[PDB]
From a paper:
Elongation factor G (EF-G) is a highly conserved and essential GTPase protein that catalyzes tRNA translocation on ribosomes at several stages of protein synthesis.
However, further crystallographic analysis confirmed that the ASU contained two enzyme molecules with a correct electron density map and reasonable Rwork (20.6%)/Rfree (24.1%) values, instead of a crystallographic monomer in the ASU as in other EF-G structures. The guanosine base is surrounded by several hydrogen bonds donated by S265, F267, and D141. The switch I region of Mtb EF-G1, essential for coupling GTP hydrolysis, was found to be disordered, which is consistent with previous study indicating that the switch I region of EF-G1 has not been modeled, except those in the EF-G in GTP form bound to a ratcheted ribosome and in the S.aureus EF-G structure.
Numbering used by the authors:
A (entry chain A): 3 to 48, 61 to 87, 92 to 701
B (entry chain B): 4 to 42, 58 to 421, 427 to 701
The structure:
C-alpha cells in the first residue's frame, strides 16, 4: 500500500463531466497515457494503448495521486458529485455549452463543486475558444476566466498561450502520442490579445486578496506563486472557473490540463467535511472530517462485474481507516459486512491495498448487502451519508404500456431504478394495467419516465402529472350516528354507531387517532377495532373530491348491537358510513402540497425572481445575501411550480439556480379548491 | 429460455455452507458460467437476487434456491430442505467442517437430502483438501468419497484431478470468468496419490453392485458410465457424499462442479414421492408423485415484494400441472385462490410461463391468503403437505413504543398466522404472541431493521391457560342494577363441568331451559357472556379452556331484562362457577428434539431433566445422537445460549408444541403471586 498516498494534499478525486461526443472518452484515454509515460522516469526500480474499463482509475501526475472517476454523462450524477472533489468540464469548441452540460453544471453549482474548463476539438473546423467561453456566461451564468489562449484556429491549432507565466506551449506539426511541447515566446499575432486577457486574470487575482491588491495597484508585478495560489483559492471556492483549450485527438494541450488539475483542483482537504446523520435520529447531524484519525465512513457509488474478480463494489472513503478482512456496518441497511480484497484500479493493473483510508477510492470484493448509495461505517460510531427518510410522494404520473413486451420491459426498469432511487414509489392496477409512479416533483417524475423510454426502451402512454392532494375537516361535529340494517339472505346484519369527529393536529406528526368511550358493553369490545378499521378504510377516499382524508380524530361514543345479527363485518360498515356522514357535516377542506423553494440569484435578477414567485402564490420568507449572491426563500405550492426550471432560466438569463424540498400540506384557497374539485369530479 | 418437461433433466438444489465459506461467490460463478458458457474487459450490473433462480447447464434445467437466513429457526430450514431435492455443501479448505455447516448437515440428514461437497478457497494459504475430508468423517460421520483431487497447493492451485475419467482439468494462470480448462494427463507428482483414491472410489462403486464386484475382482476395468451411475445411486440414497474442490474467486473448478450437480444430484423423479395428509385428517395419508398426470400440489416457501408486481409467492410444485387464471384451493386455510401471472426467475430476466408443472419452482402473483408453508392443491383431491401445527401462541412479549413518536409500526402485514396481536391496554400494550422465543426475536428484528422502530422490548412471558377439574351444580347469578333511566334484570342458573371434547373443542353450551323462564331471545346472550369471561381467568388471569356450560334455569323481567343483562349474567355466572369448580393453571409442554455431537450428549440429558424434562428416546443418526424429550416451555428459557456453549456451537434443537399439562403445586403459587401482584 506504499503506492497509496497518505498526504491527502497531494491527492485529487476528480472526474470528467461533458456532453456526449464532446471528448470525455478520448480525453480520459490521453490523460491515462500521458500520465503513464511520464511516471517514475529514471526512477523506475527495474503499440501500447489505454482503454478505460474501471469506474475509478488511479494514476499519478507530478507527485500527486489522481483518482479519476467515470461520470456517466439522474440520481447517479448527484451521487458522483459527492464522490468527486472537483471536476474537469470538457466542451466541444464547435458548440460551446450544450443543453446536457447545463443540467450537470447546475447540480455541481448546488453542491459547490470546483470546476476547470477544457475547450476540446480546437483542431476542427468551426471551433472557437472565444465563442465557447461566451456561451458559458450566456447559458450557465458562470465566471469563466480563461487562463490560456489558443495558438491557431481549425487546422492551424498548434498550442496554447499560458496566461499565468506569459509564454506559449506549442505542439507544431503532426504531434505524436505523448510528445511534449515547445515553450516559446507569445507570438506577435497574439501579443495584445494575450495582454488583454492577462489584465482580466490579474484583476480577478488581485481583488481576492487585500495584500495583492495593494501590491498590484502600486505598479508591482505579482509573482507566479501569488497568481497561481489566488486562482486555486477562487476555484476551490467555486468563485471562478479556469478555462483551458486543446485537442485531445490531436494530442495537443493534455499536459497543461493535467497541471491545472494539480494546480487548481481541490484535494480531499480542501472540500468541506462529510455531513451525514446518525442511523436513527435523522435530525441529529454527524460530521466526519478527512483525516485517518476519525471514525471510518465511506459511500458506495458503483457496482460492477470484473472480468477476473466477479462482483466489484466501488466505494469513496471520506474519513478514518479500515483493514482488509475487517467487519463494518452497512448503516443504510443495519447489516454487518466484512471487507474482502481491497483494490485501487490502475490504467493497466490492479494495485491491491491492505486498508481503505480517507480521501481515496477503492474497489471492494466481499460485500453481500451493499447497494449504490449505502454507507459503510465504523460499527461503534455509525453515520449514514444519504438521507434514509423521504416523505410520501406529492405528484403522481400514470403509465400504461402499449404491448405485452412493453410490460416486461417496464418491470425490468422499475427494478433497476429501485436500486438507484429509493425516493420513487410504484403501484400497478392489473385491471387496465395502469402503473402509477409517485415522485418528489414534476422534474423527478419526468426523469424516471425518460430513463424508462431511452435507457430501457419502453413504449407506453404517459399521463399528465397529478398533484397528490388531501382532505381534512375544519370543524367539530358531534353525536353523528349511523345504523346498518341489511337483511341479507337468511339471517341479517345489524350495527348502530355514534361517533364524534374533530380535527386532530398530531403532536408528533400523527395523521389519525381513534378513541373509544363506549360504556357498559353497548358495543361489544370485540367490535370496537372494526369501527376503527371501517373509519380508516373510508378515510382512504374523500368526501369532497375523492382525495385521502388526513388529520382526523374519531371518538366512538355509543352504539347498539343485536347478539345474533351484529358481526365484525357489520360494525366495519357502520364505521365506514358514519365517517362519510360526519366528515361531510364537519366543513371538509382540500389540502395542497407546499414546497420550500430556495433560489440563489444575482441581485439584478432578484426582483424578477420574487415577481415570478409571487405569481405562483408563493410566500416570501427571506432575502439573504450569501457568497456575493442573493438567496430568496419562499413557500410555494407544488401545484404552481410546474415548469420552474425553464421559466427561471428565461427570466434570469441562466444566472440563477433553485432547490425545491417538501415542507407541509396547507389548506387550498377557496377559489383554487373549486377548480380542484371540478376537475376531480370529471375524472 | 424454455421450461423443461423432461424432469430427469431438472435439478432443484441449493447451497449450504458456513458463513464466509463462499456461498455468495459460488452462486455468483454458477449464474455466470451457466449463462455466458451455456444456454471481457467489461463492467455492469443486473442487480437481481431471487429466492429461486432458474438456469441451464448442458441441456439440464438447474433451479437454485437461496438457503434460509436464520439457521437456528427450524421451521425455515425444514421448509427449504423440502423445496430442495439435493444440496451442494461448500466448505473452506482452511477450516474444514465448521459449526454452522455441521448443523445444516444434520438437518439434511434428518430429511434425507442428497449432498455433494465442494471444498472452496483451495488457493488460500492453509487450505488442505485432505484435512477437510477428514473433518467430514470425524465431525459429520459422513462417507465422504473424493471424486476429485487438488492439483497444486495454495497459490500453485491450478485445477483438479478427475478420478472417474482419470485426467487433470487445469486452469493455468489468471483465469477469467467463464474461461475454459485444458484437459491434460495427471502429473507424475500426483500419479501415485490419484491411484490410491481411484482404488478407494472403485471399491465403493464395486461393493454397491454385485455385477461390478464380479468385474472389478475379475480384473476387468469398470466403465466411466458404470462408475457415474453407481455414484449417482449412492449419492441419492445419502450413502456416499461426493467431494470436489475448487476456487470460486479464482474461477477454477466451477464447471466440474456444475457437471457433478447434473451427474450425481437427484432429479425430481429420483427423490421419494411427496407425503402429506388430507385437510383435518392427520392420520389419513395422501401421496403425490412427480408427474403431470397426478393431482396438483405445491408448497409456498417464500413471500417477497416485487417493485412492479407487488406480492410474489414462490412455490415448489410437486405434482401435476395448473394453468394461469385457474383456481386452486389453499388446503392449509381452506380458502380458494386464483393463480395470476406465473414466472420463472432467471439470472437477468423474468421468464413468463403459462403453467406451473411438477418438479419446478415458480413465482406467483394473485394470491391473497397464502402464507409460507401453505399447500396449494386441486379442489377435488385435497392434500396438506405440512403437518398440523398448533395455532395459539405459547410465548408472549410486550412491546412499548419510544422509551407516540414511534407508533409508525402498523405491521398489518400478514406476517404469519403464527403471530397474534392482542391489547392489554397499558399504553396500548401491543402484546405479540408467537410459537417460541426465537420466533418472536426474528419478528422484532423485522420491526427494527425493515421498519426501524425505537421500542422497549419486554421479557418473554409464557402463555399459560386455566381449566376446571370438577363439576359444580346450581350456580346462580342474578343481575339487578336499578339505573335511573331504566333498570336491568337477568337471572341464570348454570352447571359447569370440564369438557375436553371428542372434537377437541374448548367450549360447549347447552340449554336445558324448560318453560319460557328465560326467553329464547336471550339464550345466545348467556353463551356469549360465558365466552367473554373465559378470555380472562379466574385464578391468575389466563384464558380458560375445556369448559362446558349448561343453562338449567333462570328468570326474566318483561321490561327490565335485555340481551346485555343476560350477557352480564352469563359472564358473572361463569366467573362464579369456575371459581367453585377447582380451577387450575395449565402450562404448554413442548416436544424438544436435540441433535448433539457425539461428545456432548451427556450434558444434554442432565440439563433436560433439571428443566423438568421427561426423556422419551435417544436415536443415533449418522454420527450424532438425537435426544427427544417433553419439556415445559417455562423451563426452556435461554436454551439456545446454554446448548451452544455446552456443545461448542455444533448442536441443533427443535421445539414444537405437544400438549398442556397442569402446573406443579409450588409453581402454581409463583404464577398466581405474580398476577395478583398485577
Ligand atoms: N477532430 C477531433 N475529434 C475529436 C476530438 N475529441 C474527440 N473527437 C472525436 O469525437 C468522437 C466522439 O468523441 P468521444 O471521446 O467518444 O466523446 P464522448 O462520447 O463524450 O466520450 C470520436 O470519434 C473522436 O474521434 C478532438 O479534439 N478533435
Ligand atoms: N481467495 C479466495 N477467496 C474466496 C473464495 N471464495 C470466496 N472467497 C472470499 O471469501 C469471502 C467470503 O465469501 P462469501 O461468498 O461472501 O461467503 P458467504 O458468506 O458464505 O456467502 C469473500 O470476500 C470472497 O471474496 C476463493 O475460492 N478463494
Amino acid at each position: 500500500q506504499k503506492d497509496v498516498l497518505t498526504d491527502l494534499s497531494r491527492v485529487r478525486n476528480f472526474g470528467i463531466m461533458a456532453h456526449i461526443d464532446a471528448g470525455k472518452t478520448t480525453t480520459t484515454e490521453r490523460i491515462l497515457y500521458y500520465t503513464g509515460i511520464n511516471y517514475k522516469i529514471g526512477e523506475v526500480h527495474d503499440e501500447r494503448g489505454i482503454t478505460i474499463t474501471s469506474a475509478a482509475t488511479t494514476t499519478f501526475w507530478k507527485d500527486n495521486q489522481l483518482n479519476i472517476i467515470d461520470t456517466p454523462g439522474t440520481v447517479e450524477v448527484e451521487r458522483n458529485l459527492r464522490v468527486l472533489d472537483g471536476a474537469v468540464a470538457v466542451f466541444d469548441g464547435k458548440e460551446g455549452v450544450e443543453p446536457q452540460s447545463e443540467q450537470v453544471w447546475r447540480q455541481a453549482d448546488k453542491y459547490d463543486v470546483p470546476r476547470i474548463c477544457f475547450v476540446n476539438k480546437m483542431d476542427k473546423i468551426g471551433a472557437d475558444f472565444y465563442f465557447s467561453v461566451r456561451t458559458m456566461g450566456e447559458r450557465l451564468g458562470a465566471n469563466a476566466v480563461p487562463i490560456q489562449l489558443p495558438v491557431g484556429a481549425e487546422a492551424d491549432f498548434e498550442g496554447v498561450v499560458d496566461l499565468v507565466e506569459m509564454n506559449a506551449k506549442v505542439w507544431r506539426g503532426e504531434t505524436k502520442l505523448g510528445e511534449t511541447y515547445d515553450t516559446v515566446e507569445i507570438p506577435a499575432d497574439l501579443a495584445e490579445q494575450a495582454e488583454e486577457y492577462r489584465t482580466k486574470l490579474l484583476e480577478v487575482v488581485a481583488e481576492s486578496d487585500e495584500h495583492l491588491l495593494e501590491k498590484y495597484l502600486g505598479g508591482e508585478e505579482l509573482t507566479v506563486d501569488e497568481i497561481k495560489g489566488a486562482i486555486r483559492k477562487l476555484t476551490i471556492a467555486s468563485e471562478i472557473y479556469p478555462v483551458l483549450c486543446g485537442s485531445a485527438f490531436k494530442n495537443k494541450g493534455v499536459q497543461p490540463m493535467l497541471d491545472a488539475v494539480v494546480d487548481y483542483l481541490p484535494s480531499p482537504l480542501d472540500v468541506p467535511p462529510a455531513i451525514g446523520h446518525a442511523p436513527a435520529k435523522e435530525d441529529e447531524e454527524v460530521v466526519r472530517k478527512a483525516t485517518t484519525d476519525e471514525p471510518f465512513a465511506a459511500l458506495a457509488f458503483k457496482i460492477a462485474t470484473h472480468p477476473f474478480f466477479g462482483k466489484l463494489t466501488y466505494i469513496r472513503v471520506y474519513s478514518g481507516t479500515v483493514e482488509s478482512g475487517s467487519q463494518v456496518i452497512n448503516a443504510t441497511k443495519g447489516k454487518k459486512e466484512r471487507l474482502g480484497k481491497l483494490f485501487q484500479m490502475h490504467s493497466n493493473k490492479e494495485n491491491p491495498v491492505d486498508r481503505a483510508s480517507a480521501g481515496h477510492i477503492y474497489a471492494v470484493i466481499g460485500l453481500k448487502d451493499t447497494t449504490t448509495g449505502d454507507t459503510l461505517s465504523d460499527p461503534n460510531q455509525q453515520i449514514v451519508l444519504e438521507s434514509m427518510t423521504f416523505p410520501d410522494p406529492v405528484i403522481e404520473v400514470a403509465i400504461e404500456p402499449k404491448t405485452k413486451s412493453d410490460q416486461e420491459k417496464l418491470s425490468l426498469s422499475i427494478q433497476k431504478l429501485a436500486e438507484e432511487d429509493p425516493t420513487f414509489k410504484v403501484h400497478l392496477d392489473s385491471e387496465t394495467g395502469q402503473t402509477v409512479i409517485g415522485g418528489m416533483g414534476e422534474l423527478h417524475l419526468d426523469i424516471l419516465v425518460d430513463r424508462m423510454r431511452r435507457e430501457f426502451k419502453v413504449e407506453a402512454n404517459v399521463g399528465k402529472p397529478q398533484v397528490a392532494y388531501k382532505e381534512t375537516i375544519k370543524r367539530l361535529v358531534q353525536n353523528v350516528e349511523y345504523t346498518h340494517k341489511k337483511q341479507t339472505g337468511g339471517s341479517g346484519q345489524f350495527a348502530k354507531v355514534i361517533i364524534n369527529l374533530e380535527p386532530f393536529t398530531g403532536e408528533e406528526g400523527a395523521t389519525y387517532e381513534f378513541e373509544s368511550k363506549v360504556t357498559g358493553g353497548r358495543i361489544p369490545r370485540e367490535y370496537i377495532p372494526s369501527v376503527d378499521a371501517g373509519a380508516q378504510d373510508a378515510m382512504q377516499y374523500g368526501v369532497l373530491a375523492g382525495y385521502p382524508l388526513v388529520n382526523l380524530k374519531v371518538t366512538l361514543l355509543d352504539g347498539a348491537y343485536h347478539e345474533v345479527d351484529s358481526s365484525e363485518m357489520a360494525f366495519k360498515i357502520a364505521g365506514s358510513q358514519v365517517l362519510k356522514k360526519a366528515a361531510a357535516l364537519a366543513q371538509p377542506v382540500i389540502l395542497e402540497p407546499i414546497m420550500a423553494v430556495e433560489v440563489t440569484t444575482p441581485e439584478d435578477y432578484m426582483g424578477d425572481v420574487i415577481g415570478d414567485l409571487n405569481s405562483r402564490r408563493g410566500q416570501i420568507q427571506a432575502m439573504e445575501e450569501r457568497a456575493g449572491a442573493r438567496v430568496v426563500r419562499a413557500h410555494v405550492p407544488l401545484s404552481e411550480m410546474f415548469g420552474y426550471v425553464g421559466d427561471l432560466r428565461s427570466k434570469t438569463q441562466g444566472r440563477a439556480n433553485y432547490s425545491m424540498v417538501f415542507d407541509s400540506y396547507s389548506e387550498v384557497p377557496a377559489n383554487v379548491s373549486k377548480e380542484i374539485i371540478a376537475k376531480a369530479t370529471g375524472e
